Structures are given as structure tokens and as C-alpha cells.
């Protein structure tokens, strides 16, 4: 859903690291693979470092980063992870510039 400020669409692991390079703790983006669109990941800045998390899909189709917290839509998953880290190194707050 490229309408969201945090959804960057087809961007690479390496480009994500450049896009986050001047961010702070909690700067993040969600990205798609540029070869296989459908593999989506979260890249998240924390203390100078960028962490990458594959967004997994469950049997019933729900999206999750942690088994215990699964959502119908990607916006719901991001919104949840803005209030509880729940598996991530920190909470999601500041979209990387596009």
C-alpha cells in the first residue's frame, strides 16, 4: 500500500540502510523485494544499526513478525508494533524519507 508514508515498495536491504542512514531510534520503512514482490520486510534503525525483519504469512493468511501477534492487514501489524516492540529491537515510529 504505497499510499502510506512508511511503505516504500520495491526497495533493497542495502538501499533501506541508506534511506535510514540519517534516522534515529525508531526510524523505519517497510519494503518489497525488487525481484519477487510479495516478500516484504521491515527495516528499523536502532543505535546506529539497521535491523531487518521478514514479514511472515500464516496458514490463515494473517501477517506477523512474532507468532503471537498476527493481523489481517499490514497497516494493523505496523500500528501494533508502534506501541509494543513484541519481537522487534524497538517500536516503529519515524518513516524513512521517500
Amino acid at each position: 500500500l504505497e499510499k502510506h508514508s512508511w511503505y516504500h515498495g520495491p526497495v533493497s536491504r542495502n538501499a533501506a540502510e541508506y534511506l535510514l542512514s540519517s534516522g534515529i531510534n525508531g526510524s523505519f520503512l517497510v519494503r518489497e523485494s525488487e525481484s519477487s514482490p510479495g516478500q516484504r520486510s521491515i527495516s528499523l534503525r536502532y543505535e546506529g544499526r539497521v535491523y531487518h525483519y521478514r514479514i511472515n504469512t500464516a496458514s490463515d493468511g494473517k501477517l506477523y513478525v512474532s507468532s503471537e501477534s498476527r493481523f489481517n492487514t499490514l497497516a494493523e501489524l505496523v500500528h501494533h508494533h508502534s506501541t509494543v516492540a513484541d519481537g522487534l529491537i524497538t517500536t516503529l515510529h519515524y518513516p524513512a524519507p521517500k
Binding site: I24, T83, V84, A85, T91
Partner: protein
């Protein structure tokens, strides 16, 4: 030299977004504690980098009065933090 303006920016039923104004001088890091006001229960401790002026707190219990305290560490050579700044918040 103390941090100021500690507040709850926003709250869900179980988590809080807090902020404060940093002292003008270098802060090495912050220690933030939270636990029940007057509660004879374990106060939780966590840390925040000296360049941050916000944090989140999660896994809170509904209907509890929490005391939230920020200690700024202003020195690398001795580990005595500043005077605590405190607020109360009822979930």
C-alpha cells in the same frame, strides 16, 4: 541540570508514550523506572540513549496508578544520576 517536562504524550490501555525536555548539557543516558505508586511490588528499570527525549512503556495493567521516574546520567566518570523527575499516571 535536571530533565524537565516529563509527561504522558499518549496512552493505550496497556502502553504509554512519554516525553521530557533534555538538559542542555551532554546526557550519557537515562534510566527510567515505573511501578505502582505505593505498591509493594517490583519497580521495573530500563534505559534510554542520551540523545532521545521520548520512550514507550508496555505490558501495563488496567486500572493501576503508575509512578514514572526519569534519572539523567550526566557523567561518564561517576555514576551518580541527577535528581529524579516523576509523574503519576492511572491506566
Amino acid at each position: 541540570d535536571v530533565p524537565t517536562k516529563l509527561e504522558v504524550v499518549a496512552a493505550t490501555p496497556t502502553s504509554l508514550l512519554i516525553s521530557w525536555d533534555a538538559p542542555a548539557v551532554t546526557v550519557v543516558h537515562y534510566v527510567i523506572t515505573y511501578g505502582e505508586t505505593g505498591g509493594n511490588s517490583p519497580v521495573q528499570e530500563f534505559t534510554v540513549p542520551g540523545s532521545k527525549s521520548t520512550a514507550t512503556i508496555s505490558g501495563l495493567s488496567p486500572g493501576v496508578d503508575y509512578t514514572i521516574t526519569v534519572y539523567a546520567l550526566l557523567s561518564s566518570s561517576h555514576w551518580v544520576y541527577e535528581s529524579p523527575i516523576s509523574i503519576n499516571y492511572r491506566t
